[PDB]
Structure formats: C-alpha cells, structure tokens
Amino acid sequence: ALQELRAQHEDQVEQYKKELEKTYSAKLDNARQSAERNSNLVGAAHEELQQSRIRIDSLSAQLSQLQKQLAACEAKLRDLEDSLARERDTSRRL
Amino acid sequence: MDPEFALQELRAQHEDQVEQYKKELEKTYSAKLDNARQSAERNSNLVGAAHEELQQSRIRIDSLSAQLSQLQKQLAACEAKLRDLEDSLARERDTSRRL
Amino acid sequence: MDPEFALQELRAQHEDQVEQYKKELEKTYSAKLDNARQSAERNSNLVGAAHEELQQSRIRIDSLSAQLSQLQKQLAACEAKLRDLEDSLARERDTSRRL
Amino acid sequence: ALQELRAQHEDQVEQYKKELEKTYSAKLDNARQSAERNSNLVGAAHEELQQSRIRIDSLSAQLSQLQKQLAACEAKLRDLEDSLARERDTSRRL
Structure with a gap:
C-alpha cells in the first residue's frame, strides 16, 4: 500500500509537470504574439x-x-500708390 | 462810310460771343476739374485701402x-x-526571445 | 489818317503773336498728352500686375x-x-491585475 | 537512511516552492510596473x-x-482696375 501510493504519486507529478511545461510554453508564445502586434501599431503610428x-x-x-x-x-x-498720390496732388494744385 | 457800320456791329457781335464763350468755358472747366478731383481722391483712397x-x-x-x-x-x-514606447516594447520583445 | 498805320501794324503784330502762340500751344499740348498717356498706361499695367x-x-x-x-x-x-495601442496595453493591464 | 533521505527531500521541495512563489510574485509585479510606464507614454503621445x-x-x-x-x-x-481702365481709354480718345 505504501509503495503503491508512492508510485501513484510519482506518476501524477510526472503528468502534472508535463502539463505545466506545456502551458508555460503556450504562455511564453502568446506574450510574443500579442507584443508583436503592439509593436507595429507602435511603429506604424x-x-x-x-x-x-x-x-x-x-x-x-x-x-x-x-x-x-x-x-x-x-x-x-x-509704386501705384505713389503714382496716384502724385496725380491727386496735381489735381489739388489745379 | 457804310461798311463802317458793319465793322462796328461785327465787333459788337464778337464781344457778346466772346463773353458767352468765357462763361461757357468757365462752367465746363469747373465741372471737369471737380470730376477729375473726385476721381483722383477715390483712386488714392482705393489703392490705400487695398x-x-x-x-x-x-x-x-x-x-x-x-x-x-x-x-x-x-x-x-x-x-x-x-x-520610448517603441523602445520599451522592443525591450520586452528582446527579453521574450531570450525566454 | 495817321492812326490807321498804327492800327494796321497792331493787327500785323497780333497775327504774328497768335501764330507763335498756336505753335507754342500745340507743342505743349502734345507733350502733356504724351505724358498723360504714358502715365495712364503704366498705372493700368501696374494694377493689372498686382x-x-x-x-x-x-x-x-x-x-x-x-x-x-x-x-x-x-x-x-x-x-x-x-x-489600438492604448487598447491592447490596457488589455494587458487588466489581465495582469487579475493575475 | 531511506526515511532520512525522504525527509531531506521534502524540506528541499518546501524550500524550493517558497523560493518559486516569491520569484513568481516578483515577475508578476515587474510586468505590472513596466507596462504602466508604457501606458502613459502611450497616453501622453x-x-x-x-x-x-x-x-x-x-x-x-x-x-x-x-x-x-x-x-x-x-x-x-x-474696382481700381476698372477706374484706371476708363482713364486709360479716355486718354486714348484724346
């Protein structure tokens, strides 16, 4: 019973670890994907x-x-204002 | 003699017509002077406004x-x-590639 | 009689002076016409260019x-x-607060 | 020897876990800090x-x-061009 419980636990931990590393790899990949899209929306702006x-x-x-x-x-x-001023003043002298 | 009375009357006709002409000329001249004065003042006012x-x-x-x-x-x-936003997002990209 | 020769000579003096005056007037008038023509053409050319x-x-x-x-x-x-950048960084902020 | 090795391992795993959770909490907090500074440089822009x-x-x-x-x-x-054109044409008629 003792060694049966310990073998059962070791298989559970082995299965937990593989499921842990697979999720940890999926996390690291989605952080890569969402950050890239952010980077062009940065660079395009x-x-x-x-x-x-x-x-x-x-x-x-x-x-x-x-x-x-x-x-x-x-x-x-x-220039035009100068010329028209001279004509105005001439008419005033008449 | 007789032509002398035509001479005198011609002279008298001429003096009346010269007086009439003097009046006609003075009125025409003053109207054209006024018209030229008003146009000159307006052209100067227009170019100054422009x-x-x-x-x-x-x-x-x-x-x-x-x-x-x-x-x-x-x-x-x-x-x-x-x-700087470019920079820090690139910082996060580099760090992510290195896992 | 004797005054008649002064009359004739006065008339002759007058006709010479009227002819001289006619020439002087025609030359002055043509110069002022030319000056007024040139100034009008230039003012029109200037305002058109402006x-x-x-x-x-x-x-x-x-x-x-x-x-x-x-x-x-x-x-x-x-x-x-x-x-959109605001939006996705806010998406990451919200998700981070929820741990 | 067996139970001594198993007790020693359990204490090691206990120490590893606490060190793991403390680093995992520091990771989650720095991701918060660096993302905020990015958000104002977003919003300030x-x-x-x-x-x-x-x-x-x-x-x-x-x-x-x-x-x-x-x-x-x-x-x-x-207007001025109209008036000056009339004066020009008048001078041409003289």
Whole structure:
C-alpha cells in the first residue's frame, strides 16, 4: 500500500509537470504574439507621424513662398500708390 | 462810310460771343476739374485701402508661420513618446526571445 | 489818317503773336498728352500686375487649405494606431491585475 | 537512511516552492510596473497628438479668414482696375 501510493504519486507529478511545461510554453508564445502586434501599431503610428512631420515642413516652405509673393504685390501697390498720390496732388494744385 | 457800320456791329457781335464763350468755358472747366478731383481722391483712397488690407494679410501669414513652428515642436515631443514606447516594447520583445 | 498805320501794324503784330502762340500751344499740348498717356498706361499695367499676383496667391492658399485637410486625415490614422495601442496595453493591464 | 533521505527531500521541495512563489510574485509585479510606464507614454503621445489635431483645426480656420481678406483686397483692385481702365481709354480718345 505504501509503495503503491508512492508510485501513484510519482506518476501524477510526472503528468502534472508535463502539463505545466506545456502551458508555460503556450504562455511564453502568446506574450510574443500579442507584443508583436503592439509593436507595429507602435511603429506604424511612428511612421504615420513622421509622414505628417515632413508635410508641415513642406507647408512652412509654401507659406514662405506665399509671403514673398504678397511682398512683391505690396511693392507694386506702393509704386501705384505713389503714382496716384502724385496725380491727386496735381489735381489739388489745379 | 457804310461798311463802317458793319465793322462796328461785327465787333459788337464778337464781344457778346466772346463773353458767352468765357462763361461757357468757365462752367465746363469747373465741372471737369471737380470730376477729375473726385476721381483722383477715390483712386488714392482705393489703392490705400487695398494696400492696407495686404499689410493685414502679411501679418496673418507671419502668425501662421509661427504657429506651424509650434506645431512642429508639439509633434516632435509626440515622436519622443512614440520612440520610448517603441523602445520599451522592443525591450520586452528582446527579453521574450531570450525566454 | 495817321492812326490807321498804327492800327494796321497792331493787327500785323497780333497775327504774328497768335501764330507763335498756336505753335507754342500745340507743342505743349502734345507733350502733356504724351505724358498723360504714358502715365495712364503704366498705372493700368501696374494694377493689372498686382491683381494677377493676388489671384496667384489665392490659388496658393486654396492649395494650402487642401493640404491641411490631408494632414488632418494623416493625423487621424495616427490616432487610430495610438488608440489600438492604448487598447491592447490596457488589455494587458487588466489581465495582469487579475493575475 | 531511506526515511532520512525522504525527509531531506521534502524540506528541499518546501524550500524550493517558497523560493518559486516569491520569484513568481516578483515577475508578476515587474510586468505590472513596466507596462504602466508604457501606458502613459502611450497616453501622453495620444494627448499630445490630440493637441496637435486641434491646432491644425485652428490653422484651417485662420486660412479661411485670410482667404476672405485677400478676396476683399482683390475686389478693391478690380474696382481700381476698372477706374484706371476708363482713364486709360479716355486718354486714348484724346
């Protein structure tokens, strides 16, 4: 009875261990799978933000081009205002 | 003699017509002067208003450029939190591969 | 009699001076006409160039607005990847609290 | 000798188990700590992106205001161009 109980226990522990290591291997593999998917959703969010980064770099360059164009328009209007001021003052002298 | 009375009357006709012409000319000249004065003042007022509005627009574009720079700064810090996140998830990946 | 020769000579003096004045007036008038023509053509050319440049600037601002919208779309998708990341890290947090 | 070996083994397994559960509790706690820090770096990146979101909403509103202002400038220039065209044509008629 004693050695029968001890042999029965040893087989139970042997079965428990194999079931333990198999679950421990499944845990380590699912932690790998769920972490990878997280890593691209990390990296994809990074690359989509970097795309936006360089779009606003382009937007700032285009704002500077627009600013030069309006500055040239203003210089033409200053010239025109000068010429029209001379004509106004001439009419005032008549 | 007799032609002398036609001379005198021609002269008198001429002086009446010169006076009439002087009045007609002065009225026409003052109307064209007024019309030219009003058009000159309006063209100067218009070009000044247009010019002023453009100076306003340039101030607005200067502000927009400054705000784009702050937006750059804001999106830089967002990239930092994303890189550290990349980093620690990669730390967990490396440690998991080594079991 | 004798005054008649002063009359005739006065008339002759007057006709010479009227002819001189006609020439002087025609030259002055043509110069002021040319000056006014050139200034009018230049003012029209200037305001047309200014106006055209402003139409160019409006096209540029229409483009900038369109690009801001695409930037909105790009940053929306970035928020999606950040929310799902939020979501799965929260999934791991909840599961860890339950041990 | 037999029962001495079996008692010695039982004490070893008892000591191994307590050392196992203590390490298993330390593992579960560090996974909690490292995941939290990851979660704010997630959420802080989210809130800083949302801040940028509403800045560009403001930028688009300001672009529309600027567009109206330039459209009003253009209408003044059209008026001025009309008036100057009439003066040009008048000078051409002289």
